[model samples]
Target chain A: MKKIPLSKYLEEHGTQSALAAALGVNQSAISQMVRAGRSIEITLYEDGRVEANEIRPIPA
Target chain B: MKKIPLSKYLEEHGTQSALAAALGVNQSAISQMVRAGRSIEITLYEDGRVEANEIRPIP
Candidate 1:
């Protein structure tokens, strides 16, 4: 099964707040990830879609 | 006149930690920007470079 893609969700939702809701994470957490590109795995597709490897904990 | 771009700094620095130092802003603020795409104007150059507007507060 494919993990819910971050890029896909971001594009469809058009906001971090919305994406966080779908992923069950806080808006700030999503904001951090989006900015730092850490914690989650991002794969960009030829169709201009981006996906996540999985929702995981961020390292300290 | 050229504005010291945010994207260029991020690319060369490869982390918010570094860019924040150069721009004299807090890491959290840079983090806020990279995540939310707020405040700063991010421009991607045809040369795969990114630039930002004047360094300023988040507001």
Candidate 2:
């Protein structure tokens, strides 16, 4: 099995609540995402900027 | 106007002095790079590794 690559959690959202609102989930989800390597799909702007919207596990 | 996103600096160099030496600049330059997101043209190796050579402002 392939190992889950370890990564540091970066709060990509501008504001804490905005981040939460973007997720449409609870703060604990973000917490778990940070601690664990909960994979998230990020939306990137035209300038190569990323905005994290949802947190989920990587699909095989 | 757009917001200047904040980012944490990661020491991408194998050695501190090597990174400084590669830049041909002072140690403070790296510090400034960390504090401010100074745009830098990084050369990436075959193994997806990036080596920072020059530091400047992002366009």
Q: Which stretches of candidate 1 lie over 4 Å from their true place?
A: A1-60, B1-4, B39-59
Please write out the lDDT profile of model 2 over residues A1-60, one tens digit for every residue. Answer: 111211332443244345455546566665675676545544535654434533221111
Question: How large a fraction of the reference contact set does each model reproduce?
Answer: 0.00, 0.00
Q: Chain A only: list TM-scores of all candidates.
A: 0.43, 0.43
How would you encode candidate 2's per-residue C-alpha lDDT over B4-42 as one tens digit per residue?
Answer: 211212343244345456546566765676566544444
- Backbone clash pairs for candidate 1 read B5-B52, B6-B52
**lDDT over C-alpha atoms for residue B37 of model 2:** 56
Residue B40, model 2, lDDT: 44
Residue B22 lDDT in candidate 1: 47
Question: Which TM-score value belongs to model 2?
Answer: 0.28
Cα lDDT of model 1 by residue, A1-60, tens digit: 233445555666457765555445567877776677543544445665444444321111
Which candidate number maximizes lDDT? 1
